[PDB]
């Protein structure tokens, strides 16, 4: 079982990051969403891969 | 640039709302035989 490297990469442009500055936790909220979406990626790669 | 104002608005885009009025206000009315007619005066103009 080659523990191959899966490349997960996410970026948040400065325009979209300063456009939505009205929220005090925008980075935090998108971080949690990405964490959970990576869990779903683990499931979905395990089956659909 | 020292005279120019600076402000730390924490929003990328906004508007500036000024109230103003719609014109003359004071006007006597014949309250004995006429109602006191009331008219709104707030011309909220919005910049960007």
């Amino acid at each position: 079982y080659r523990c191959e490297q899966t490349n997960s990469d996410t970026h948040i442009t400065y325009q979209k990051l300063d456009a939505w500055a009205k929220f005090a936790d925008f980075q935090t909220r998108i971080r949690d969403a990405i964490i959970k979406r990576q869990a779903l990626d683990r499931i979905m790669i395990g089956f659909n891969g | 640039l020292k005279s120019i104002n600076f402000y730390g608005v924490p929003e990328q885009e906004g508007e500036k709302i000024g109230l103003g009025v719609s014109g003359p206000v004071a006007s006597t009315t014949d309250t004995t035989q006429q109602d006191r007619e009331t008219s709104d005066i707030s011309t909220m103009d919005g910049r960007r």
């Binding site: 939505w20 936790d25 949690d32 969403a33 959970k36 779903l40 499931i43 | 709302i17 919005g46």
Partner: peptide, 19 residues
């Protein structure tokens, strides 16, 4: 002019990964 909206942030829940 605009009554321009007030916006609150809420996360649309992704599928639960309890599996």
């Amino acid at each position: 002019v605009a009554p321009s909206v007030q916006q609150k942030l809420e996360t649309k829940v992704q599928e639960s990964s309890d599996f």
